[PDB]
Write a protein that binds this ligand. Structure first.
Ligand SMILES: Cc1cc(S(=O)(=O)N(Cc2ccccc2)[C@H](C)C(=O)NO)ccc1F
Ligand SMILES: [Cl-]
Ligand SMILES: [Zn+2]
Length: 495
């Protein structure tokens, strides 16, 4: 277990000795991201914003993560008024702005979120530039390769949560009848299209395998290439250069300490090699689907924006998502709306970076607090559908159903466009549907209650569910909405 630390240490001996105090501080920052301090955030708030925050039901919000909710709730307690022991519209906007300022400074998370596209205007300019400087300086530190003397004499190990690659499959990976076992069925789906993988940040790996901690059932075993650059962090730990490619050599179920884990064997290869495979796939899926949809042969509609560790599945699931899409929506509705999207250079974007870092969003969303990360998104200004692979939509079974919901937004767009082409608007912004929403808006899904646009898209998704039960359910519980959507569909195919 410890017999190989010494020769890695000696290999990087000069490198470790020549490390500046600033270099060391940088590596330390990379390993331990800087959390926000409660008192710092509290003191920065005005007296009215303090009074507002302490009245807000934080757990009610839908855009705040678990982590962000807990931190804010702790602020509420520390803020002390007279009642202290010895969501609205105003409150939503406040929380959306405050969210941006309670994020820890996390270099590896910034790289993963952006997929290396660190110029993406998804964070405040000042911290965005600081990330850039740090990342550049880290790249400069990681200059010594593992070399021909050691690349095939060691394995590098990493434990990983399944939710990092796929939170959808991750919800069922563990056997529900026995948590020491892996669900063999869910295992097969995870492994099926896992052929390659990309690291856009700095992998922190060990020379000897280490016990998995909470919620880690994936145990990576990695061989580097001679050219792979790295740094020694002592204690048998390495930090690897960013932007490296990984070919998946084997995925197997293994037993350790009477618990079942998933072994992932991977070989480091040039990232350019993997990116070539992705481009050929984008070239292929576009040629295939232009023919199916009857689009011009030169149309670029489908785009792969992938940069992270489950890369091959993002590509392959695009074929599956679109097939289900074509199978559950009538062909003539699909042709009309897709052509409208294409007419505005709209895209179907499949990605494993967070959606605020997708150009088809942030180009038309300067306000960072108005930017959105989710499983799926539709942006009318760019007429694009965005689908985020790794995440898991709350109250949403799979990616295909998410996509259909997003296509509902597109249907919403085109229908409203047909009513008035130069003064274009959403059909859900018309008084007629607003009235329908005010009456039936609470009769479908919980999220459907949010606004007219989401109610429409939810009603649309459910109307095209493979479950013949759910369709009837929408007709019964939201008859006016059901009728309205069918009316728009008729309006579209006759246009
Ligand atoms: C139910 C459902 C959700 C999403 S989603 O990606 O998860 N989503 C809504 C949301 C996000 C966060 C917290 C709660 C809800 C986004 C915002 C959505 O409406 N897409 O157009 C996409 C598609 C879909 F059908
Ligand atoms: Cl093994
Ligand atoms: Zn939506």
């Amino acid at each position: 277990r410890y017999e190989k630390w010494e020769k890695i240490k000696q290999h990087y001996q000069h490198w470790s000795d020549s490390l500046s105090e600033e270099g060391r501080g940088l590596l330390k920052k990379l390993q331990i991201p800087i959390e926000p301090k409660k008192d710092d955030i509290i003191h920065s708030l005005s007296q009215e914003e303090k009074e507002l925050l302490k009245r807000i039901q934080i757990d009610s919000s839908d855009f705040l993560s678990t982590e962000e909710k807990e931190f804010l709730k702790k602020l509420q307690i520390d803020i002390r008024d007279s009642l202290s022991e010895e969501l609205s519209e105003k409150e939503k906007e406040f929380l959306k702005k405050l969210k941006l300022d309670i994020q820890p400074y996390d270099i590896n998370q910034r790289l993963q979120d952006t997929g290396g596209l660190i110029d993406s205007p998804s964070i405040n300019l000042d911290v965005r530039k600081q990330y850039k400087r740090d990342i550049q300086n880290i790249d400069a530190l990681l200059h010594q390769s593992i070399g021909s003397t050691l690349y095939n004499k060691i394995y590098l190990y990493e434990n990983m949560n399944i939710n990092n690659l796929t939170a959808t499959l991750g919800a069922d990976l563990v056997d529900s009848t026995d948590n020491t076992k892996i669900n063999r069925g869910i295992f097969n789906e995870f492994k099926k299209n896992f052929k390659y993988s990309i690291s856009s940040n700095y992998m922190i790996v060990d020379i000897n395998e280490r016990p998995a901690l909470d919620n880690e059932r994936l145990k990576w075993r990695i061989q580097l290439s001679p050219d792979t650059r790295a740094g020694y962090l002592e204690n048998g730990k390495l930090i690897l250069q960013r932007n490296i490619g990984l070919e998946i050599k084997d995925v197997q179920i293994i037993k350790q300490s009477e618990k079942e884990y998933i072994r992932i064997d991977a070989k480091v290869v040039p990232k350019s090699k993997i990116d070539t495979k992705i481009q050929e796939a984008q070239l292929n899926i576009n040629q295939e689907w232009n023919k199916a949809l009857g689009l011009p042969k030169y149309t670029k509609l489908i785009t792969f924006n992938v940069h992270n560790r489950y890369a091959s599945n993002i590509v392959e699931s695009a074929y599956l998502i679109l097939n289900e899409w074509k199978n559950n929506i009538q062909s003539d509705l699909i042709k009309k709306v897709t052509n409208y999207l294409v007419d505005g250079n709209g895209r179907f974007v499949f990605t494993d970076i967070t959606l605020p870092n997708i150009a088809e969003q942030y180009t038309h969303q300067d306000e960072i607090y108005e930017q959105v990360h989710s499983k799926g998104l539709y942006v009318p200004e760019s007429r694009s559908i965005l689908l985020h692979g790794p995440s898991k939509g709350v109250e949403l079974r799979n990616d295909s159903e998410g996509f259909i919901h997003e296509f509902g937004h597109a249907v919403d767009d085109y229908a409203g466009y047909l009513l008035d082409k130069n003064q274009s608007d959403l059909v859900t912004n018309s008084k007629k549907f607003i009235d329908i929403f005010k009456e039936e808006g609470s009769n479908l899904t919980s999220y459907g209650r949010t606004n007219e646009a989401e109610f429409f898209a939810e009603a649309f998704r459910l109307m095209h569910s493979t479950d013949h039960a759910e369709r009837l359910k929408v007709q019964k519980n939201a008859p006016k909405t059901f009728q309205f959507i069918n009316d728009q569909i008729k309006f579209i195919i006759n246009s």
